[PDB]
């Protein structure tokens, strides 16, 4: 039997200091329903400092590390959505920017959704995003997603039509699929959207969001010390997704158009 899956965007409704603060964010996400403006947050001074460190250090790296599509959209976000060292962008603002650019929108989320539920969001061009800020003790890498990761890792590529299409298609393929198919698609997502490298004018560049928000892993990924294989869905889908550490291997796509084509061939075989 086919599992429940959303048929319209609203069906996604059916999917000590620091701890106290995290509960505040978790409630904002839990109370949200489709159609609501995403609640705006007044960030603390410490939170803004953490953002500023992350933002300043990553922006020194992007020109030499990030793919061209990332770099194209990054300045648009400083102009329209308040991306600056001294200001944490709001999810509602970013959501409205994306809706105009590619039809993508944001929903706040408290922590992880299942891979099935997360991917189902992408089918409607909805990206579930956290709103809290990583703990100030390690700005350079965090093992759980935070708003810095969403805003600097994901958003600039969600604003690119080719990438938005690629992402949506992973979601669309997942809807009502078998457990095994969802796992394979989630793994493909992990090694493209989350931790992908691509080749542009012969150089290795970064498009993975998890790399683009981690000062330390971004540098590691292009350092020459990392293992690197071609993106090939039938092989890549078998690779373990790790969380404690830097990735043991990265996959290299040729372009967003090519990765999209490879996923189209692949998803035929898992229907
Ligand atoms: C999106 S999906 O639903 O298709 C999917 C695919 C594969 C696995 C999972 C999944 C699901 C659950 Cl319920 C729990 C955990 C995971 C995976 O965890 C993560 C962590 C994850 N982070 C964690 C946080 C950083 C960024 C990336 C790492 N450093 C960054 C930084 O410092 O800024 C932030 N990103 C993904 N996609 N999955 C795990 F299996 F553990 F690796 C989800
Ligand atoms: Fe992510």
Binding residues for L-tryptophan are 112, 134, 142, 213, 243
How, if at all, do strands 197-200 and 203-206 pair?
Answer: antiparallel
Token duo for residue 13: 């409704």
* Angle in degrees, 0-180, between the axes of helices 179-189 and 115-123, rounded to the nearest 10: 70
Determine which residue's CA is closest to atom 37 belonging to ligand 1. 190
* Structural domains of the chain, count: 1
Cα torsion 177, 182, 183, 187: sign: positive
Token duo for residue 33: 């329903």
Ligand closest to the CA atom of residue 241: 1
Q: Which helix (H) or strand (E) element contains residue 197? A: strand 197-200
Q: Report the separation in Å between the CA atom of 85 and the middle of ligand 1, taken as the mean of its atom positions.
A: 26
CA separation, residue 21 to residues 43, 123, 149, 248 (Å): 10, 32, 18, 33
The experimental method is: X-ray
Indicate the SS3 state at residue 206.
strand
State the alpha helices, DSSP H only, in 106-224. 115-123, 147-148, 155-158, 161-174, 179-189, 209-212, 215-221
Residue entry with tokens 């090694």: 191
Token duo for residue 23: 């509960």
Distance CA 257, CA 30 (A): 36
Token duo for residue 27: 């409630």
Candidate from 55, 109, 112, 248 with most ligand 1 atoms within 8 A of CB, to mutate: 112
Distance CA 40, CA 38 (A): 6
Distance CA 126, CA 251 (A): 25
Burial class (CB in 10 A: 0-12, 13-18, 19+), 256: buried
Active-site residues: which are they? 149, 154, 194, 213
Indicate the SS3 state at residue 85.
coil
Number of H helices, E strands in the chain: 13, 6
Distance CA 238, CA 34 (A): 35
**CATH number of the domain enclosing 174:** 1.10.800.10
Ligand closest to the CA atom of residue 152: 1
Note the resolution in Å, 1 decimal: 1.5
| Residue 235 belongs to domain spanning | 1-271
């Amino acid at each position: 039997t086919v599992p429940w899956f959303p048929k319209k965007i609203s069906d996604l409704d059916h999917c000590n200091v620091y701890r106290k603060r995290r509960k505040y964010f978790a409630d904002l996400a839990m109370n949200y329903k489709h159609g609501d403006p995403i609640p705006k947050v007044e960030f603390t001074e410490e939170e803004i400092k953490t953002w500023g460190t992350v933002f300043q250090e990553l922006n020194k790296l992007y020109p030499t590390h990030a793919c061209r599509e990332y770099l194209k959209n990054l300045p648009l976000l400083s102009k329209y959505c308040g991306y600056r060292e001294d200001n944490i962008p709001q999810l509602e603002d970013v959501s409205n920017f994306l809706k105009e650019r590619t039809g993508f929108s944001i929903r706040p989320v408290a922590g992880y959704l299942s891979p099935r539920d997360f991917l189902s969001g992408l089918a409607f061009r909805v990206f579930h995003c956290t709103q809290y800020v990583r703990h100030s003790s390690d700005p350079f890498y965090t093992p759980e997603p935070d708003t810095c990761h969403e805003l600097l890792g994901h958003v600039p590529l969600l604003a690119e039509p080719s990438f938005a299409q690629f992402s949506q298609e992973i979601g669309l393929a997942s809807l009502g699929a078998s457990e095994e198919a969802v796992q394979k698609l989630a793994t493909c997502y992990f090694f493209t959207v989350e931790f992908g490298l691509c080749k542009q004018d012969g150089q290795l560049r970064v498009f993975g969001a998890g790399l683009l928000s981690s000062i330390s892993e971004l540098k590691h990924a292009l350092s020459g010390h990392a293992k690197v294989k071609p993106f090939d869905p039938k092989i890549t889908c078998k690779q373990e997704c790790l969380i404690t550490t830097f990735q043991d291997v990265y996959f290299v796509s040729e372009s967003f158009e090519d990765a999209k084509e490879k996923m189209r061939e692949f998803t035929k075989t898992i229907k």
